[PDB]
Amino acid sequence: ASDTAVSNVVNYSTDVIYQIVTDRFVDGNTSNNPTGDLYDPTHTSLKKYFGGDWQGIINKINDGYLTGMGVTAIWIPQPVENIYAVLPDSTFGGSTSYHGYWARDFKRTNPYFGSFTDFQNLINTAHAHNIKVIIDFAPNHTSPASETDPTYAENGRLYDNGTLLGGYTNDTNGYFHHYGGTDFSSYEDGIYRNLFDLADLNQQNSTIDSYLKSAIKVWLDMGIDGIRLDAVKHMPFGWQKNFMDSILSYRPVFTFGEWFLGTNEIDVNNTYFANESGMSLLDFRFSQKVRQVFRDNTDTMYGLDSMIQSTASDYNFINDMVTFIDNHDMDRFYNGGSTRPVEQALAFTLTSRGVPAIYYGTEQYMTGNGDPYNRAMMTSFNTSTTAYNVIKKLAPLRKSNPAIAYGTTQQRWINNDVYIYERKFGNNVALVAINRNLSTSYNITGLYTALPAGTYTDVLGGLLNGNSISVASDGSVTPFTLSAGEVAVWQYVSSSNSPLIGHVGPTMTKAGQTITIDGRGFGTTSGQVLFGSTAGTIVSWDDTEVKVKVPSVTPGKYNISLKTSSGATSNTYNNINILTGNQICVRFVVNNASTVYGENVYLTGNVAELGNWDTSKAIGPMFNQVVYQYPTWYYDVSVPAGTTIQFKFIKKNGNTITWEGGSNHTYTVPSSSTGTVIVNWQQ
Ligand SMILES: OC[C@H]1O[C@H](O[C@H]2[C@H](O)[C@@H](O)[C@@H](O)O[C@@H]2CO)[C@H](O)[C@@H](O)[C@@H]1O
Ligand SMILES: [Ca+2]
Ligand SMILES: [Ca+2]
Ligand SMILES: [Cl-]
C-alpha cells in the first residue's frame, strides 16, 4: 500500500477532512429519533436533536456527494452515549446533548446516532469509498452538573457499560474535581477546575485512568482511523501523554487535540503540547489568521506569511497541523456579501501545509454566527456551487502532488493584498497566487519560481479567475495581471524522485513498535532506515512508504533518515521521540519548597521522560494553587511503568538554578495504575 491509501491511518497530510455535525447532517433513519422534548422534527429549535444520524452519513457516502467533492476523511462528533435530560434554556426553550459532548457512558453508543452495528456500517462504507473516519472523544468531562443541585441535568453521572460509577454529588470515590469552575486565567486553573458547568473528570484517579484507556480501545476495536481529542488545554499534559501512549501501543491512529486559541493569542504551552504529547493539534494560529486576513479585515497578507513562518518555526511536525477556517464553535466563515473570500480561504487551506478540515456546509455558503446558529441543518447538496468545485479541483492534489502534502512553504511575492507562495518537495512544486482585493488588480513583476521552464495552466481552470503563466529557465515568470479576487494554482510533479521523507508517524514510540515513513523515491528494493545512526528492522518497503521496527536505542529524540538499496540518502525527519517503556501518569508532589518572586519549582530526573537531568528541559513550572497550595508544588507526569527513577527538584527564574541538596529521591513507578509520589524539599 502507498502513502495515500485509506489504510494508512497515521498520516493525514494527503487527505482532506470533512467535519460533520451528525445530528445536523442527514436523518437517515427516523425510527432512531428521540421522542418528546428531546426532538424537533421542524429543525428550527437549535439546541434540540434534529435526528441526523450515522445512516444519513452512509447515504451521502454511497450517493457520491462526499466523494464527488474529493473528501477523503470525515470527522464526526463523539459517538458515545450522551445524557437524555433536556436542560432549561431561556433563549431556545430546552438544551440537549445533540452535539455529543455530554457523555454518560464512553463504552456505549449514542442510540440516536445509531447502534454499534450502525457505527460498523459507517466505518465499512467509508473505507469502501477510501474515506477515513475520525471520532471526537472528550475525556475531560461527562456532562453539566451542579453539586448543590443534584436534580440539574443528570448530575454528571458516569456509567461503565451500563454500570453506574458515580455522579458529581456525593462523589465519595473522587472520580471528579470539586474546585469550582475555570476562568481561563492560568494553565493550572483551566485543568483542575470545571470547564463551564461540565463535571470535570479526575484522570489521576486510577479507576478513571483505566476506564478511559479501556473506553478508547472499544472504539479502536470498532476500526476508527483517527481521534480528535476535545479540550486538551483542560487536562494535564502528563496524563494525556500517558493516554496517547496507551492508544499508540494498542493500535496507532492519527490523533489531534483541540487547544483553543483566540486571535493573536500566544501560548507556549500549546507549542510544547504539539511537540511532546504524542498527538497533533488543530491549528488555531492558522485558522484565526486566515479569518483576520480573508474574513474580518484585521491583518494583511504580510500577517498571513508571518503566521506561516512562525508556525513552521515553532511546531516540530508542521505537516500534522490540522487546519480549518471555521468550526462548530466559531462564526460561520461566510457572513454575507461576496462569496469570493470564503472561496479564497478554502483554496488557501487546501493548498497549504498540514491536514485541511472543512466544516459541513461551507461548500453551500451556510451562515450563522455563534453556537448554535452555526449548527443549522445542512441546507443543500447542490454540487454546482463554486465552493464545492474549488474543493473538488484542489482536494485531490494532496494525493497527486507531494509538494502539497509534504512540501516546504516559501513566499514568492507579497503585498497587503497579494500572497504568492510556493510548496516544494524535491522537484515537485506547486505555486499559488491569491489576490484578496475584490476591486483592485496587481501587476506581478519580479516573480521567481522553482517550476521548470514552460507554460502552466491554472489547475482551477479559471474557476476563481485564474490564468496561465510562462516560466523561463532561470525561474523568472513573465509579467502578468493578478485580477481582483483571483486565485490561480500552477504545478509540476516530477517523473522521478531522489529519496525524500515527507512524514513519519507516530512521532512518539518505543523499541519494537512500528513507525510509518512516507514520501517519494525510496525505490522498490529494501534499503535501510536509520534512527540517528542506528538501523531499524524493515517490516515493509515501497517507493512511497516504508514501515520499520524501532531499534533498542537509548530513549530520547531521534532524527530519521532513509537509504535506498543503491545507497542514496534521504533528508532527515527530526524529533521522533523514543520512550523508555509503556507510560504511567504519576503525580509528583514536593513540600516546603519556598521561592522568591518570579522563581518556580521544576522536576528533573534520570530518565528521558524527566529530561535526563537537563535543567533547560526540566518539567514545569510546577503547579501550586488548586490540588495543593504553595509552598507545596505538584505536577502530573508521564513516566515509564515499573521503572525505578531518581529525581530532584530545582528552582529557577531568569538567572540561576538552585538544586535540592542531599541524595536523589527515588521511586518505582507503578506497573499499570496511576501513582502519587510525595517528598520534602531537601536543602
Ligand atoms: O524579484 C525577487 C523578489 O520577488 C519578490 O518581491 C516582490 C515583492 O514581494 C512585491 O511586493 C513587489 O515589491 O515586487 C517584488 C518583485 O519585484 C519576493 O517577495 C522577494 O523575496 C524576492 O527577492
Ligand atoms: Ca435519525
Ligand atoms: Ca479538566
Ligand atoms: Cl503565528
Residue 456, helix vs strand vs coil: strand
Task: Classify 124 as helix, strand or coil.
Answer: helix
Residues 6+ apart with CB under 8 A from 269: 187, 233, 237
Is the distance from CB of 366 to CB of 389 less than 8 angstroms?
no
Judged by its nearest atom, the ligand closest to the C-alpha of residue 310 is 4
Query: DSSP character for 509?
Result: E
> Position 545: which residue type?
E
Binding residue ranges for Ca(2+)? 27, 29, 32-33, 51, 53, 140, 191, 200, 234
Q: Is 137 in the pocket of ligand 1 (CB under 6 A)?
A: no
479 touches ligand 1 (CB under 6 Å): no
CA distances from 650 to 601, 633, 661, 665 (A): 6, 11, 10, 12
Its sign, for the CA torsion 610, 613, 616, 621, is: positive
Strand, coil or helix: 376? coil
Cβ of 445 below 6 Å from ligand 1: yes
Q: Please tell me the distance from the alpha carbon of residue 627 to that of residue 203, in angstroms, as a whole number.
A: 13
- Mark the binding-site residues for substrate, compressed into ranges: 101-102, 141, 194-197, 228, 233-234, 328, 371, 375
Residues with catalytic roles: 230, 258
Dihedrals phi, psi of 240, to nearest 5 degrees: -70, -35
Half-sphere exposure of 497 (CA within 13 A, CB side): 26
- The C-alpha cell at 37 is 422534548
* Ligand 1 near 415 CB (within 6 A): yes
Q: Say which experimental method was used.
A: X-ray
Residue 151 and residue 452: Cα distance in Å, rounded?
69
Per-residue exposure over 175-194, b if at least 16 CB sit within 10 Å of its own CB, e if not: bbbeeeebeeeebbbbbbbb
d(CA 66, CA 381): 10
Q: What is the DSSP letter of 565?
A: T
CB of 381 closer than 6 angstroms to any ligand 1 atom: no
Distance of CA 300 to the CA centre of its chain: 26
Cell reading at 317: 511536525
Q: Which ligand is nearest to the CA of 482?
A: 1
- Among the bound ligands, the one closest to the CA of 299: 4
* Of the candidates 110, 137, 133, 139, the residue with the CA atom closest to the CA atom of residue 121: 133
Structural domains of the chain, with CATH: 1-400 (3.20.20.80), 401-495 (2.60.40.1180), 496-579 (2.60.40.10), 580-682 (2.60.40.10)
User: What is the number of other CB atoms lying within 10 angstroms of the CB of residue 400?
Assistant: 13
Question: Whose C-alpha lies nearest to ligand 1, atom 5?
Answer: 413
